[PDB]
From a paper:
To assess the basis of the transcription bubble extension, we determined a 3.0 Å structure of an opsPEC assembled on a partially non-complementary (nc) scaffold. The nc-opsPEC was virtually identical to opsPEC assembled on the complementary scaffold. Thus, the extended ss regions in the opsPEC form independently of the precise sequences in the bubble and the hybrid, suggesting that this extension principally depends on the NT-DNA hairpin.
In free, autoinhibited RfaH, an α-helical KOW domain sequesters the RNAP-binding site. Upon recruitment to RNAP paused at an ops site, KOW is released and refolds into a β-barrel, which binds the ribosome. RfaH recruitment requires a 12-nucleotide (nt) operon polarity suppressor (ops) sequence, which induces RNAP pausing.
Residue numbers in the entry:
A (entry chain I): 1 to 893, 911 to 1342
B (entry chain J): 99 to 147
C (entry chain J): 246 to 831
The structure:
Amino acid sequence: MVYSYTEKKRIRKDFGKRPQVLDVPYLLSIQLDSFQKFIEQDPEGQYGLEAAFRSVFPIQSYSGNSELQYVSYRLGEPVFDVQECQIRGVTYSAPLRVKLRLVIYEREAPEGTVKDIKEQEVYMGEIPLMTDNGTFVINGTERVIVSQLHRSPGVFFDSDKGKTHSSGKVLYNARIIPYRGSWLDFEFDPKDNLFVRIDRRRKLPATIILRALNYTTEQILDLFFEKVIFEIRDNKLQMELVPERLRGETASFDIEANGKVYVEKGRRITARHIRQLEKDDVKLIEVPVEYIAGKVVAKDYIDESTGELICAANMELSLDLLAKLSQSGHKRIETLFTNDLDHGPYISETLRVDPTNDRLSALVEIYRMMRPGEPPTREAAESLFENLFFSEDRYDLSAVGRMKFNRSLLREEIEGSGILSKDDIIDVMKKLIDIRNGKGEVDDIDHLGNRRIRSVGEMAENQFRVGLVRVERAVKERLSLGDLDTLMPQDMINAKPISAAVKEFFGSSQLSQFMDQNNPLSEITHKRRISALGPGGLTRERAGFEVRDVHPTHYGRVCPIETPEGPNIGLINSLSVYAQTNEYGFLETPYRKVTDGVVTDEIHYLSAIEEGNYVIAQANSNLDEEGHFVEDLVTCRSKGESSLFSRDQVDYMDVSTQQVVSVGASLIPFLEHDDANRALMGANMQRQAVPTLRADKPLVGTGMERAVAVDSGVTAVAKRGGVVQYVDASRIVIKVNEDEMYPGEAGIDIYNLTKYTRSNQNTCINQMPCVSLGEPVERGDVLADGPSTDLGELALGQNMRVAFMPWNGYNFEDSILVSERVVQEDRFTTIHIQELACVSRDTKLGPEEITADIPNVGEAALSKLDESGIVYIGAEVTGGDILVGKVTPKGETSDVKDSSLRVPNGVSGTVIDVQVFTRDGVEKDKRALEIEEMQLKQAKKDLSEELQILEAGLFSRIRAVLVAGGVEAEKLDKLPRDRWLELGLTDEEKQNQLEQLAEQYDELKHEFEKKLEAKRRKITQGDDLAPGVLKIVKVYLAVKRRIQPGDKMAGRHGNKGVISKINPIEDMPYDENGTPVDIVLNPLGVPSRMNIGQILETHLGMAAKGIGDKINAMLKQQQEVAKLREFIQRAYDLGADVRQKVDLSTFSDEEVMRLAENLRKGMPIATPVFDGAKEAEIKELLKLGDLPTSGQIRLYDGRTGEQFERPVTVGYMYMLKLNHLVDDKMHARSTGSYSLVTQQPLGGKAQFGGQRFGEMEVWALEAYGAAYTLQEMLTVKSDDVNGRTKMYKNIVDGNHQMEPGMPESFNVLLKEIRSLGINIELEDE
Amino acid sequence: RERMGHIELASPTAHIWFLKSLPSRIGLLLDMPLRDIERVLYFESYVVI
Amino acid sequence: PPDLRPLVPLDGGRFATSDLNDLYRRVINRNNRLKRLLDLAAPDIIVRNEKRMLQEAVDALLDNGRRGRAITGSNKRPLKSLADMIKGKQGRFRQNLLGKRVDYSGRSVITVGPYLRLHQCGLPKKMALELFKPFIYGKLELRGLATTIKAAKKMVEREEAVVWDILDEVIREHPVLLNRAPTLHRLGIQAFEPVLIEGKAIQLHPLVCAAYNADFDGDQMAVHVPLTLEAQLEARALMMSTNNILSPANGEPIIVPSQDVVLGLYYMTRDCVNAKGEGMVLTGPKEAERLYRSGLASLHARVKVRITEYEKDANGELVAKTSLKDTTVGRAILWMIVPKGLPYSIVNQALGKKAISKMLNTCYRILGLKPTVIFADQIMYTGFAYAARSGASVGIDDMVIPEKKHEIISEAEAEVAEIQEQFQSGLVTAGERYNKVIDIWAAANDRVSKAMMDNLQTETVINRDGQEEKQVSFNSIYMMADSGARGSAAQIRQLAGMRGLMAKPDGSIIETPITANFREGLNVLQYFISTHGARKGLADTALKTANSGYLTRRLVDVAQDLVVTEDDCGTHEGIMMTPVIEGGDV
RNA sequence: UAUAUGUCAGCGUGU
DNA sequence: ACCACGCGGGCGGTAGCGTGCTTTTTTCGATCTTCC
DNA sequence: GGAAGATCGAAAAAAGCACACGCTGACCCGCGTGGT
Ligand SMILES: [Mg+2]
């Protein structure tokens, strides 16, 4: 194939064998597409702000003959750009202006038309806008709103597994869960009685809700039972017989018909007798009167002669009752067909237990259950019942909820009203009864087809709807009582509730959290995260065991190995590579359709529910170039289980081998050789690696580094193709090609790289250009490398020469031995930026001034401060140094106290940036003016570059026009270009053209001046801060942290440790060539923690470094390009039928030279997650270089020079430096500050504090003798102030004796108890 | 840290720890239901001394 | 009192809000309003409402959430009442009385110090300087380098040369208490003698790691400094590392080699049927060490050496016996560090973890405590040194896959295909067919594991006098498994044989097992199958901690007040103990 | 040793 | 006529605080059944 | 033959949920109402 310009610089060798049929989708699309459904205009609504507006509007006025309607909404242009909001600390948001129309109808006419209409556009608050990277800018910080995995609305049938009853009986229940409204529950009593609960309140008989639905008893029995008709004729007591009704029941009497005795009494009815009965098609069977006594009448029967009912509906029949009904003149009766197992009499028993007998009684009972305090009323009960489930505003089953509700009940339609109906409840009850009988089965709660994903758009829409109803209440209240003559639509509404709700959601929420900025992988993982917690979701403490399990439906939708380890395990997951959401929010995964035994290239996205019907073949299925599986039996998955199937029974195949893992888990080479726990640890640990000052490509990769680097916004991607007009360490100017030029455009794209900007994790964000001056570029090509990126490839760690061998116990358990060469080369050195803020507020006594004059400070301390009172940029400040000088007015009773910002103790670094935010109306100091001047200088430089290129084009045009008539090109260059404008030609169209060009030039100059003025106004605009604070000054300190013992390092295969010793170079083991190894690792970790992937990666890295060494050796000899081409082509052609084909013949000589220069440090190798290189391929690659195929070489001891008795596995491993630095973890305190209430040492390391001697340590001391040690820990060292003073004085005086005294914590507790009505005291007797 | 103070309540007030900590000491000693205690205490009904 | 509910000053004129102050203010306002209403002869309804609201305010002050909705403050949250700040995990009883923060304490990550003795630990210079500041001040004032406390503070801040000598003097025999964050049992905190080291990480003795349940993967430890003479003597005599050698739970020893010492001793104490310098006769262990260091002999050469072993007679006197013993060079070298009272039979074998533990137990039983400690330190040093000398490494070729695995797998697949055909014919129903399939796969897994173990245990063949001879393999994976250093039969089976059957999250066994080695490639389906068990185990481990901690706290409370207060009751009562047996096992 | 002024939530890390 | 204390602070709705934890204690309503 | 003691079951309430460490956010404010 063809390669991009950035890819041709360094082509990764791919060992993948299976060809790819679907490209990796955009990783952040899930975050972006959802926001595209929230702000985009929807002609039919059902999504975004349009759905909320249509759900709320129109708004009535309690039958006030007036209302207001919503027409359309528009999102205004944001005032500040994303970078501007980040710099200024404001929230990146856009205004929302809604078109409202207040209509007032003619008074005294109920049918009268409109008397007045007032249309207006009203601003209803500003909503945040998601940037191009799927993140929000709130208060100058980058926040991410993770998706929520919750339970879909609809009906769910479940049952306790015979636990609560303690008798093995299962109590089935059905739950109706709406999007908004009251939850409904139906439950089966242990005595087989149906009960109904609303909002998990006290249970009530199920027939109460039916009676409240205006259903009589006869209708209930008709709906929930089958009628059996008994008709007395010729004194034989005949009845209509259905043969299936006599299955499994013992014959109490003789079943004889048509003169043939089918069955005799005492023997149960067999299926053969039933078949014979339907053969003869007998409908009338003689039945004795004794069989009637066990039957329940269905409908009321009332004697016509006497006018009184012989029997009501639904009670047991009796001999006197049947005799009375027979003598009453009725010849036909109806009973309920009740079977012991097929059709239980649950409804009849529920009616028997039901105390209510009418609709009004049922409504009264429901009202007294919901609101016991309020006495029942007809209107109140009716209103409560209507609002419970049949009110659109109060009850709302979403479209997905209605779809699931209809699907669970086997309804063809998937659309309907949001509110509930009588038919829905009846069908739910019937399905529950059928499930109890045996037909059907309960649903799976943890099934991924019953779980929905709510993204940012859905939660934002819900919060907007909440704010809309909040403002609608006030709108109704104001409109109903106010005067309608002069009511503008603007003042009726208030944007304050909407703005408050949206800010509360976006800023302070369980799902809107600070975005991790440790590395691009961290951001990618955080953005593609699904959390089961949050509002309307599970809790960490009460999650349980079943929820955290890996359901079989997680295949291809949720990564099974990427999940946090700890309390929230299984509740937080990462989306798969190819996973995507449906229209209703359910997860779906791609598959390739198999037709007639061939695997077609068409892609179908199957959801969890619909994928169980088909048979999906495994990804690792071998084909024969004809789409046919070679093996007769293919290992597929049909219904939540894996089994062998015939090759003609398959319906779908996996699109790729990475379909099952996430982005983070797919970055681990040789994952199939690693244990699942170790793979999980490695995946979690990968996203914790701090970037280094020099990025190093992974020698052994998976080929997904490019996608992760490009999709994340860390790198600078060219928007349009062209050539690099100007390159610099801080900015890039690209001259775009004429094909992509817009009409009337200068034609230059300017990228301003971020240089040493503090991240959310106090790390360094730096962008370095990766292109040269004049180098052609194309769309989508990386122009600058962000943090942890190398030429467009993700680079988390460094390639270290590792050797697996024990070394004098310095790698005993998990420790790592590191050579001094790693320290000297500064490979693992990191840069950490810390921000310190000092705010000058306006106190009641007076304001706080930031001045360089501070009392009670020497001249040496103020040397670093400038004339404005702010530390100089570049000054090195240690702990305790003064950065910003501030004075606070003293009490009324100098008159100024020192409140200046100081560097925290133990914190060093270099001041690299100072940012001053000044509230409007406060005079700016020199530093703020200088910062504004430099910003204006940069903006003017950009605008002047654009103006210069446009003016050069215009002057070329005017010169070309003038040359046609004047023909003085030989002298035109003598005079400057400006004087070309004042020159006049002879009177023709040329003079008119010159005048037009001159006026166009003047207009262009005026437009550029206007743009510069606008930019200056934006730059000098005053900053908005919280009330009460006047100024804010932020200082950034950069510290270079070098590696040292105690620092935590790790690998990509779950192997982690801490550096135990920085050994000198001469002490490291060395090979025959004398090259020392960089890192020594303990082999003992490999067997117990089963991760052979690290060993395979070591072997592959050794092979890659051998190839790179060969390339470097050939380069150092100034060999001709033919040898390099041949060797690199041979290296790229190595493997077995690999899908990657690289043809160096098409490459130019300069391109080949550049590729060789890039590869001289090692040939990158792509090893897919499950289609990676085999052992034979690794051995072949090792044989290509001058390295043994065993992977183990002979090593000599550095200290003694004696060859090690056995070969040792040496190679190159990608090692990462985790964000756990020892110097950030130290703490030590002898005596320091103490708390106020408890007089105990403070906690933490930021403030000087002591370690906590908790309950467990006290118990451990009590296990020993340790009486005096415990006493000194409890009294002398913590609480006894006199004890503390005496102990310190004694230690200073050389006496190691202590006075116990009385701890202050006990006195505080005694006073606290005494503050109540309880007296507690110490008795001296 | 040691000196305390007192507030003279205009009307008597029941102690919650002897009120709603089951078994209710007020109810147990007075032999009458806790809901009656709560109703008479929070000024919703009358009780005869 | 006001100082127990202080108004914490903040930046500028702002002051920190206190819930108790707000509750008191509300109560005072209600009382004042009620007083002014009573003084004005207000109607019954108004005074009744005021009295009810005052009662509610008093209730909220005493206990916010006890009755009704708790009163919320400016933070849209219920305020902390008097009862809320005394009870619970955050109350004064459990947060400031039973446990509290202490002075003279520090915290840092832990690395491994192989050179340290059993009673020593490595303390960074900065940590020791900060912790022992008052002692340094006192010594400086006594020695006359400083005249006032301020001068001593300035000198220690400037870190003068004499300060380091003073710090060395003050930590000569001053124990420090090292404690890990989870203090499950008594051995979670132990006293060590500090040794000044560079760097920034505490160096911990390897042999105590098993007692601490601590690994060098990023674990952190806290250090405390006893002050009074009594505390130092308790640390030296009661909580010292050397004093803790047997687990109080069951009496089992707690100091055992774990990973590298066992491997080194196993490699050193091994024999090869044809090695360099085999069959020669040596005068003693010193000659063996000289020959091994000079390279003239191999560590596994079978030789005959003159060993003098001392044994204890009835009177306890040591009597020597000198004899020629057939052993190896490595065993003779290791005999040098063995104390005199022990016999030679302990080291004349391949020393695994069990063998080393037994030798340490015999040393403790025969000699005492101090010789046992010295022997353990020497054992650790020798094991580390010879593990480094061996250069053992794990490679992709060390996990040998048997050539018969394919045949066994094919036979098992043929058997299960026959069973499936029988089920399709209708002779056998689903349940028994599933049971037979499970049994067949289990038998196949057992056969594969047995074949792999047979291949691995005696793979090496050595030419002795031109004849092939079978000996115990020197494979690194097999050596690690056999020596007991790390790994077990199940893990080696997963590495080199089939992974076997796997279970669903509900517990049901899946019909198709994972027939792929970890050396080979596990496809997507097998990995997804194994993830179920992996996630189940991880979730169980994560959730077990809270229940275990609650149970431990309840047990500690219920047995907190029981101590030994007498020597003999004189009671003749007791319980009768018999061996426990339930139908087949003892 | 007494110093300059620390309390609550939410999130995360290691056992 | 504008403004600074003040005070309590809950959203949402004819009120009531519930939807995916487990164990222990108390209370009341319905049912039984014992017996004089 | 019915009142009172015993029993069963549902419901409501209360209390519990390991240890250690790190980071960030908030520590006003908005109606309202009499004082001026
Ligand atoms: Mg650890």
